[PDB]
Amino acid sequence: MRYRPFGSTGVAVSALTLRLADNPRLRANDWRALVFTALENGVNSFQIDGDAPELLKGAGEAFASVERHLLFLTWRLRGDAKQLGPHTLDALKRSAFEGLSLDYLDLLLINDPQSASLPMAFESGLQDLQKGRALRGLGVASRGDIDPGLLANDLVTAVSSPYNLSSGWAERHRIRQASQNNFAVIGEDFWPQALRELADVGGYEFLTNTPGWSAEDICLGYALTEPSLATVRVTADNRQEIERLAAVVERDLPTGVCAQIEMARFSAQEREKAARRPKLAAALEHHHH
Amino acid sequence: MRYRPFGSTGVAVSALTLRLADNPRLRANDWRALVFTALENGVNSFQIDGDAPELLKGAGEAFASVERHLLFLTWRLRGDAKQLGPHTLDALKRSAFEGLSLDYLDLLLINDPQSASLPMAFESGLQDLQKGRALRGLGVASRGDIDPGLLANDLVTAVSSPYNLSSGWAERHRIRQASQNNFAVIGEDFWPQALRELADVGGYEFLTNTPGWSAEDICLGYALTEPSLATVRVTADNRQEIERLAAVVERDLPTGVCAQIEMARFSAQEREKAARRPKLAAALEHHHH
Amino acid sequence: MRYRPFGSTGVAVSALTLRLADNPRLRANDWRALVFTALENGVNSFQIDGDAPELLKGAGEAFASVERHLLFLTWRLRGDAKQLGPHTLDALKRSAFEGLSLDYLDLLLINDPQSASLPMAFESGLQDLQKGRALRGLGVASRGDIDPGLLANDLVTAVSSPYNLSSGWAERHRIRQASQNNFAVIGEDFWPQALRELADVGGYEFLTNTPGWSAEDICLGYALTEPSLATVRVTADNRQEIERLAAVVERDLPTGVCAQIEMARFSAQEREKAARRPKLAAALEHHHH
Amino acid sequence: MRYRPFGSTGVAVSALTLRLADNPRLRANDWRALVFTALENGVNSFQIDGDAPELLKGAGEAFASVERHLLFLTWRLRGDAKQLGPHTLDALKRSAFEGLSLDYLDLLLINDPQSASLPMAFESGLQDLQKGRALRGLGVASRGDIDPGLLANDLVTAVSSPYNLSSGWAERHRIRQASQNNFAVIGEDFWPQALRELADVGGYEFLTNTPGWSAEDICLGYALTEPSLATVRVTADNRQEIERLAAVVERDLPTGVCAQIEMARFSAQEREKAARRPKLAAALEHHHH
């Protein structure tokens, strides 16, 4: 395992971040063992994306097995950010601080409100948690452009964004600009469904025809080469998956794979212009006034 | 103006769809004048993205200035789709039906719920609207991969998705696969903030240095050549912007521009691997048991 | 080994043509050994490009070890083709016919005279050889564009031209147009010195860093995939090199190597405009009379 | 016009060199007029590539219209360089020196002998010319790789080599390496027949469809951006072509044209493997011993 600085927090994070999300088949000791396995593969960054009592119990017990400062703990808070408030923060206190037995969270990762501001009572509660050292930073998850007025908020220290080997320059520019402005960036969706379909049929078929590599491992290896990502979020629900993903961190992508990734970006298909409808255009032109 | 079939449900839609969104500057007469200009430039497809009374009043007057069957009217319903319920349908009746003075909507465009299903009471209410012809289709707006179980819902006839000249193959595959499966696709974000920033400095600087073309117009022309999009959503708050955008529909992109769009996709800035931290990895390995 | 049609002649040749070129350290035994190894690897096409007695002796012996009609034997005749004459025909009779113990040549491959015509006496000598059934065809070797009036000569059935994985479209167009116009095309210089230097430092370094492939074998494998070439000329001076080159005919290039070959074609270096010399230019413009 | 250092010689040459080649359809005053037009457009570098009495008379008269030391005059000596001898020197003295009325040549440009050495008597004669200050340098023209032992000869200060926008990296490496080793490099064949054909149909069609530019001028523009070339050789036979080519030296190629040039390098077409002939292969393998 390799380790990167998390933005300007001064905390080193493993190249992979393990997301823990509700799975009703899992009981508490499964969650504890999942985290134990991640720790044994050098993963110190965890993202809690669920709040079932068994998840909190097992995860909290595993986190307690190492000294707190060795871990980076993010709570993922979904829902319409514009509708968050004091009841949200009460729930966060029950789940994150009682459920996981934490004194502080490193990062609260919320949805992009698509606004320059947060609701007042929620932001005031966040400020309270920050001054109490119970919350060390706020992050914004987005699949588009986050309002710079929101990123300028003193609470906001991190962003989360998708990035994969078929991302274009808009997505790449978002992560690189955020990193150059000293935000920590968490990469998401290194292996999205659309790319799994492309890997089977078409220009990306090399992803399933490269000796010694799976398509998923190639997509992870590529995201791991991107300078602007502090860490790449992965989800794994058994030991074998954690071990394989962590193994990718120490491998080198073949240069021929890199060239095929670049080759594959080309796009040719164009459209002939669509039909004229002068009758329709004329009726619209002659609207009543 | 040119017109495209909207998915498998027949209707002709202008290659541009005009998004009408809350702007506290504009009163009802300004909204009416804006829709009038749109109509006069051949636009018959409008997406209402807001519920301010002045907006509903002016847009509804303007829509009534032509025969209803010439227009394709989409209501954009934001917010967490998992929290939609009967109150949502009440508010829709007041705003979209009474407020715009409509008997039916061509499309209700909701956020991706990131689930294969919608809340049951809301879905039951939508089924009621559909059986009465008050709602002709449901669309799902997403910046990721929509669950196929949701797309298989009989209500769902359309998807909306970002596409621009810096989009990669994941985004492109989503819209081509949707189209091939006979969904109507509305293109979004042809001119996102990230691309505006790239157009000023770097490999996309040609966007602001092409004789006879603005960067925005190049980005629109490119979107208009994508075969899978039924229509391209644009936001324009004055007559000049509407006229310029509609003029793009009839122009041909220079071949040197298309070549530069393809050459700009390349990306070569690839990390050196991060730090080992063997003390940290060992401490994590040696967690208590 | 695979066998291709040699242009429109109606005869077949091995995908490789072994060139035998003067080498002062080799004796007849050594030349015979080389030809034997090539025969044992399916090569039936040989190009004699030297006239040292030991070369003619050893090669003639080896050719006499199989039925003459199973071989395609090309004599390479260098020198200014505009200076060829009766002395040339006399020397050809000593070296090619008496020296190799041949009754006929499959091809006489001369330099491009950079003209539409051949010297009269030389051409009459070639017509005499063809009427005597001692010469089946004339070929023209060039590194530029051959005069089409020369190619229209009834004697000329074949051309020889460079092609390698760093060739561009002018080179490629020449060989494809010759093949489409029913000439046999012999590929030369699949592994020129300049590419051996590129293979060591720069964008072509992958040629020496591809698992299981040597740089020379990749360059031959690429030339073997060009559709316009009837055969690829190779030079080898030891058994083991002949066996490896022949083995490439049955191998498949990795798709990642093909991608790197395409990626390597890009060139971005540009110079700034040079110095103005207004006084020098004014002096030149003010020339007398 | 712009002027570049001619390798490490210490002298400057115009960025274009005008080649004057034998043309039976021109008379002395036509040649004089071509040289005059070149001079009036800043060209001071001329290559004489023929020896017709009318060519020598007209070109010599035009060269005498300016101070000799302002011109760079190259005599192009074709023929098999391995056959050069005393006759060649006598002919050079009669044609280049007496026929052009010159006391010295700035450069003698011979064909690549394809050897590390020149014939002794010829080389001794060149040494006599140099000691007499009648010859300032020897250049070697090649379409392949010149033996480094020949380039190391103290006489040889320049090379001439093809370079166009469809050239590959082997050609480009040759010229950049020569320039880095302090040779003057003359660029040849900026506009070869093969490229004229590609410009008419195919991926290079943009060469004849670019507003404001001819195909020829784009090809010359690209060659003028190559850093390793001291000058680009052109052959023009009318006033207006000379003026347009000189004008290219002061123009900037559009970035869209540059992108298309890089686009066009791609080559996709491949060959399936040819026929097996197991009986022929077996017959060759069982050659007699």
Residue numbers in the entry:
A (entry chain B), B (entry chain C), C (entry chain D), D (entry chain A): 1 to 197, 216 to 307
Sentences from the paper on this structure:
The recent identification of SmbA, an effector protein from Caulobacter crescentus that is jointly targeted by both signaling molecules, has opened up studies on how these global bacterial networks interact. C-di-GMP and (p)ppGpp compete for the same SmbA binding site, with a dimer of c-di-GMP inducing a conformational change that involves loop 7 of the protein that leads to downstream signaling. SmbA stimulates Caulobacter growth on glucose while preventing surface attachment in its active state repressed by binding of the c-di-GMP dimer. The major conformational changes promoting SmbA’s functional switch affect the C-terminal helix 9 and the flexible loop 7 containing c-di-GMP subsite residues R211 and D214 from the RxxD motif.
To understand how a flexible loop 7 influences the overall SmbA structure and its ligand binding, we present here the high-resolution structure of a loop 7 deletion mutant (fragment 198–215, hereafter SmbA∆loop). In addition to the SmbA∆loop/c-di-GMP complex, we also determined a crystal structure of the protein in the absence of c-di-GMP. The Crystal contains four molecules in the asymmetric unit. Overall, apo SmbA∆loop shows virtually the same structure as in complex with c-di-GMP with an rmsd value of 0.49 Å for 225 Cα atoms. Overall, the SmbA∆loop mutant retains the TIM-barrel fold with eight α-helices on the outside and eight parallel β-strands on the inside with an extra helix 9. Importantly, in the SmbA∆loop mutant, C-terminal helix 9 adopts an outward orientation similar to that found in the ppGpp-bound active state of the protein. As measured directly by sedimentation velocity analytical ultracentrifugation (AUC-SV), apo SmbA∆loop is monomeric with a sedimentation coefficient of 1.73 s. For completeness, the affinity of ppGpp to the SmbA mutant was also measured and was found to be virtually identical to the affinity of the compound to SmbAw31t indicating that loop 7, as expected, does not contribute to ppGpp binding.
